[PDB]
Design a protein around this nucleic acid. Structure first.
Ligand code: MN
Ligand code: MN
Lengths: 87, 297, 198, 114, 385, 206
RNA sequence: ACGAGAACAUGCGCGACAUUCCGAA
């Protein structure tokens, strides 16, 4: 059992909106800065990977499965992407 | 002799066992309290002469707010299951009960008007074997939790020095606790010793019948003249000897059969501090002196 | 002559205390039959202090004379008479304000190793702010063993503060902290001004 | 009283002219946030910081009334706007907790009748 | 008056039970026992190995034979002592016939038997119902096998029934013109035959062991729900048997296995005493707070309240046991706020809308909320993995 | 002589921490103060589960008592006869007063209602969902006790606690976790043998 | 010389597995 940690920066090219003004963007309450929820990322990659709960077995192991009688832990743990200090 | 009323208000649940740890009795006979006093006296390095020779105590009896309960006299009632199930009769109603004047409804009401506590059964474990590759032993301890205004009382007859010694012993017994699990939190109480006013009135009366108040037993000579037309209840007073000095291993006392409190005799008998030990290092005393409350039937 | 020392104080709950046994409750705590208030049995305090003191010492004569013995030949009367720790009146009034229940239901689960499914459980616990009035009587059978025994009582109580009382306290529960309101010799000439716990 | 107002404005289910828990989530999140502030402080009287924050709760009550008409009808019929006044008048924790219990009972019966 | 005087003389005999010599010999003990039996706790009688008194060792030996055989032969040689220097043993038809052939003045009793050919047997009407003896696997553990359940709390139930005012029924129930030795003797026989014989048919198919039926009382140990269900079946059948005119009250207890046997009977005896208070036609279920009527428990508690809850919660994926516990907490307190919290709990409970209104109505009215609590508690015990 | 190594510190919630509990999905709160809490069972379960996976899982493990002997020793075992005490006792981590006053400034609510949704692959419609999270600025006073039954095995055990704490720092403590929640970072304020003569000066878990 | 005396209702257990605040302008 090993853990490999992918740290990086996601630089936003256009106007990014994740609205949790008709819809204010989600913000981390502690700093009031905008935040990209890790569930927004994980859901988007999982949906795009499936296109490209019943999914392909490769996708099921990658992002997790909750099928009755066979539960697979999510090999991917996308965390909240917080506002960069440098930015 | 002088009669002092001792009122015991209990801080924690008390375990009064008849024959089992699971039993949860609300009272203890005079033999149980007297053995508690002898144990207390020997601890406090007091003399046993006053307890053994001059002290005449009675069974611990229920008491609640504005009422003092006495044992049911074993008299013939001239709905009979109401008196059969009745156990304790308030002092204000005790003179009436002997004369009659109590219907089955009244006796049933009296029994339900006893607000003395509520029995229960706590279940515990013994993890002694768990450490030694074993299993826990779930054992049950039956305890009685008295209501806030309720508790047990008992009257004491003796001289000035006998009563004064009992004031010392009852003060020390507050913290030893009476009961069967007193080293595991069951039996703590606070007791107040006061001269009895209403009880002195009840003990002053002189009827044709005599009523036991303590678990008593006549000697051979007295049993000849007292048993005639007697209505009683022989209770098997059993148990183990509670002493570090009596023997290396805990052994049972000789079975002693004593009349229950409330037994009515037409002839009074003075009991005895019977010895229920068997070749032990010391003599085990089982109190069987008689506290007599005469009444008119 | 014989002396008795009355240690009375508070058992402040530091984490939800569950000592297992009104209606149907999933793993209920032990309660006073009359007042229906959660209590800490004296046998539970006595057993946990004996367990921690036995580990500290190492049955040993120090433990046997302090918590009682019944073994053949060496029958020792228990010097420690640890009464049931009842829910204090102060914490009752304090919990009546905030309308906070004296006990709380803690919800957990057990994720299976084989199937990775969570099987829920519930154990009732006495709420953290609770305080129990503890009443211990130490019987001074020896005037020479009292100082050594009260050192052992302090060691067992110090271990109990770093441990848990009854329940699954390895998973958080049971943590307590003792406070001594007074240590007064109710019976006998022995003095306890020098004596102390914690 | 909380059961009465929900009963009277319960219509066939349309409650308070179309009020849901999503419409009230902005107000109640502030109310229980204020509740934790009062809960923690052991004072028989409301704190000065709490009082100014409760005034902001009154402002947010009118703001939500203007935004959602259903919430506006909910507030007027209840007098929860008037209840936030009297708690500031008495300025005691006990009165405020009775007000929070009133609002909690309000949404409880509101969900019960839906 | 003749029967009252006979019982009056009996009570006088019971008071002065013993005489001068018998009392003195009771206190004339030479040797303390220093050893006692596990069950009888008797030290005066000689205790053999396994720490059992001679009587209780015979009692255990009678067990594992009472279940299998139906002949109780009083004979010079047997397991438990009997008067006239005889002993009682339970043997089969061949074993009993042997014993009576060997030595005369030997009595043989047959239990619940139809009349048979010429023999010296005496028919004894005895309720010997024991569900464990039906299955050989459960026969090994007699009553402790009822603790074994796939679903439901393992606790046993103890039922202690007792007919109300049976003595008043014999003395005052029969009018003067209809009172006689024959009319009374018929009433004794019908009541005896109901308990001794009819009880076995009533408790058929239930995990219940009949400790005693005998004339007026009753004692059963079995599954907690089977005891409650057959208590209601027995109450209904008793009303048919007696055609009204006689009601019995019962205490029902919920005690685990390894619970003290004395405490199981004593605490249920206390419950029956509680049900004996008032008009006496009541059942005391579990705690002393649930002293319900027989119709109230059967209809209001179970059919009217518990059954709707069980059906509603079964229809969902999980059988409750979390809404039920939260319901009980909100029903235990008398606060006005807890009513509102109960309203919110029912709304989020995700069951039918008319049931949430019913549960809310039940919690409102006293003597109807306690029925709701008992309904919830019965349901909670019904589902315990 | 019985010795116990107390590890006291903070659990800084790097992301929103959602450990579920009783009453859209409320976090478990300490009832006395109504502040969000981290139950010691959540910590002990997460450390044990991560460490057992790191050590290795016996195939077809039907019970927790079939863990590695290192896991059973550290976190306790319940096998009949071979009952093992748990060397590590992990207590509930309450909302620290230091973080509480910090949240009193800016008037933070100690929690945030995070709005998620599910986009069904077939219908392509979003089903909304609200889950409560302890705000990322929070920190919990965590308190652990390590029983010393074998002095020789303390170094091995505190290496295992080092691995368990390290594993938990990368993973979550409760809630979605793989969806971002539950990230935490352990801060070790001090280590001290409160009772017992054991030398915990040369001891560390992070 | 209290049916006594000794006895932890205790041990193991994540409220957890999947879940885009999204389509339309
Ligand atoms: Mn009857
Ligand atoms: Mn009867």
């Amino acid at each position: 059992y090993s853990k490999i940690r992918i740290v990086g920066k996601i630089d936003v090219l256009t106007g990014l909106h994740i609205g949790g003004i008709a819809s204010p963007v989600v913000r981390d309450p502690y700093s009031r800065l905008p935040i990209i929820p890790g569930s927004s990322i994980k859901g988007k990659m999982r949906s795009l990977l499936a296109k490209h709960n019943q999914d392909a077995p490769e996708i099921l192991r990658l992002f997790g499965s909750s099928q009755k009688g066979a539960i697979q832990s999510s090999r991917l743990q996308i965390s909240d992407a917080f506002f960069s200090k440098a930015s | 002799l002088v009669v002092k009323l001792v009122k015991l208000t209990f801080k924690s649940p008390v375990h009064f066992g008849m024959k089992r740890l699971s039993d949860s009795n609300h009272t203890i006979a005079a033999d149980t309290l007297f053995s508690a006093l002898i144990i207390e006296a020997l601890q406090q390095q007091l003399e046993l002469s006053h307890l053994l020779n001059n002290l005449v105590i009675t069974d611990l009896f229920p008491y609640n707010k504005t009422s003092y309960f006495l044992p049911k006299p074993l008299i013939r009632i001239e709905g009979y299951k109401a008196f059969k199930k009745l156990t304790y009769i308030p002092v204000e109603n005790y003179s009436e009960y002997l004369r009659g004047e109590i219907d089955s409804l009244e006796a049933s009401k009296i029994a339900e008007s006893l607000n003395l506590g509520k029995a229960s059964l706590s279940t515990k474990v013994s993890l002694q074997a768990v450490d030694h590759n074993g299993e826990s032993e779930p054992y049950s301890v039956g305890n009685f939790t008295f209501y806030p205004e309720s508790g047990l009382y008992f009257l004491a007859k003796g001289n000035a020095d006998t009563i004064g010694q009992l004031e010392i012993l009852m003060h020390a017994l507050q913290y030893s606790g009476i009961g069967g699990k007193r080293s595991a939190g069951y039996g703590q109480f606070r007791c107040t010793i006061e001269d009895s006013g209403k009880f002195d009135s009840l003990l002053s009366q002189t009827g044709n019948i005599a009523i036991l108040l303590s678990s008593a037993m006549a000697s051979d000579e007295e049993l000849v003249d007292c048993l005639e037309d007697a209505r009683y209840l022989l209770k098997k007073r059993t148990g183990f000897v509670q002493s570090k000095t009596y023997a290396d291993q805990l052994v049972k006392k000789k079975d002693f059969y004593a009349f229950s409190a409330g037994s009515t005799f037409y002839q009074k008998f003075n009991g005895k501090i019977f010895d229920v030990s068997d070749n032990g290092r010391h003599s085990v005393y089982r109190y069987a002196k008689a506290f007599w409350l005469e009444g008119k039937i | 002559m014989y002396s008795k020392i009355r240690i009375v104080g508070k058992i402040d709950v530091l984490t939800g205390l569950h000592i297992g046994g009104i209606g149907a409750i999933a793993s209920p705590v032990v309660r006073d039959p009359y007042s229906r208030l959660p209590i800490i049995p004296g046998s539970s305090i006595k057993g946990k202090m004996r367990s921690l003191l036995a580990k500290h010492i190492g049955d040993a004569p120090e433990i046997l004379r302090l918590f009682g013995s019944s073994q053949k030949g060496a029958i020792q009367s228990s010097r420690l008479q640890i009464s049931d720790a009842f829910f204090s009146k102060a914490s009752q009034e304090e919990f009546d304000k905030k309308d906070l229940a004296y006990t709380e239901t803690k919800f957990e689960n057990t994720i299976s190793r084989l199937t990775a499914v969570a099987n829920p459980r519930q154990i009732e616990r006495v709420t953290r702010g609770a305080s129990f009035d503890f009443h211990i009587i130490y019987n001074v059978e020896n005037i020479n063993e009292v100082m050594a025994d009260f050192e052992n009582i302090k060691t067992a109580i110090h271990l109990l503060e770093n441990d848990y009382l009854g329940g699954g306290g390895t998973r958080g529960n049971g943590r307590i902290r003792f406070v001594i309101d007074s240590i007064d010799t109710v019976v006998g000439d022995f003095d306890s001004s020098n004596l102390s716990i914690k | 009283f909380a059961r009465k107002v929900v009963e009277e404005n319960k219509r066939v289910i349309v409650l308070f002219n179309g009020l849901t828990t999503s419409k009230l989530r902005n107000l109640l999140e502030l109310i229980n946030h204020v509740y934790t502030k009062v809960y923690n402080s052991d004072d028989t009287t409301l704190s000065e910081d709490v009082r100014d924050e409760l005034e902001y709760l009154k402002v947010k009550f009118a703001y939500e009334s203007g935004r959602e008409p259903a919430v506006r009808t909910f507030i007027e019929k209840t007098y929860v706007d008037k209840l936030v006044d009297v708690v500031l008048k008495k300025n005691t924790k006990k009165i405020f907790l009775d007000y929070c219990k009133y609002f909690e009972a309000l949404v409880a019966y509101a969900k019960f009748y839906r | 008056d003749l029967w009252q005087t006979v019982s009056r003389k009996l009570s006088d005999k019971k008071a002065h039970k013993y005489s001068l010599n018998e009392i003195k010999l009771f206190n004339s003990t030479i040797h303390a026992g220093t050893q006692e039996c596990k069950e009888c706790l008797r030290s005066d009688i000689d205790i053999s190995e396994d720490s059992l008194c001679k009587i209780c060792e015979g009692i255990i030996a009678i067990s594992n034979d009472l279940r299998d055989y139906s002949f109780f032969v009083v004979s010079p040689e047997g397991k438990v002592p009997l008067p006239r220097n005889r002993y009682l043993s339970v043997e089969n038809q061949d074993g009993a016939e042997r014993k009576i052939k060997m030595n005369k003045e030997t009595r043989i009793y047959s239990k619940n038997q139809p009349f048979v050919g010429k023999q010296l047997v005496t028919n004894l009407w005895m309720c010997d119902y024991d569900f464990s003896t039906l299955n050989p696997e459960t026969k090994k553990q007699g009553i402790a096998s009822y603790v074994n359940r796939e679903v439901g709390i393992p606790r046993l139930g103890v039922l202690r029934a007792d007919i109300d005012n049976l003595g008043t029924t014999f003395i005052k129930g029969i009018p003067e013109q209809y009172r006689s030795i024959s009319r009374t003797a018929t009433l004794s026989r019908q009541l005896s035959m109901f308990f001794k014989f009819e009880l076995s048919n009533i408790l058929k198919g239930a995990r219940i062991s009949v400790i005693y039926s005998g004339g007026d009382d009753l004692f059963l140990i079995g599954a907690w729900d089977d005891v409650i269900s057959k208590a209601l079946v027995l109450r209904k059948a008793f009303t048919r048997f007696s055609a009204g005119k006689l009601t019995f009250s019962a205490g029902i207890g919920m005690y685990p296995v390894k619970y003290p046997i004395s405490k199981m009977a004593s605490e249920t005896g206390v419950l029956e005493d509680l049900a004996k208070r008032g008009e006496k036609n009541q059942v005391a279920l579990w705690n002393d707070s649930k002293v319900f009527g027989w119709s109230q428990l059967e209809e209001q508690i179970l059919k009217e309240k518990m059954i709707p809850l069980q059906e509603a919660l079964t229809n969902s994926q999980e059988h409750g046991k979390s809404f039920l516990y939260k319901m009980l907490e909100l029903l235990r307190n008398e606060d006005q706020i807890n009513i509102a919290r109960l309203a919110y709990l029912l709304a989020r409970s995700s069951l039918s809308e008319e049931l949430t209104q019913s549960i809310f109505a039940w919690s409102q009215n006293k003597q109807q909320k306690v029925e709701l609590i008992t309904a919830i508690e019965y349901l909670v015990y019904q589902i315990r993995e």
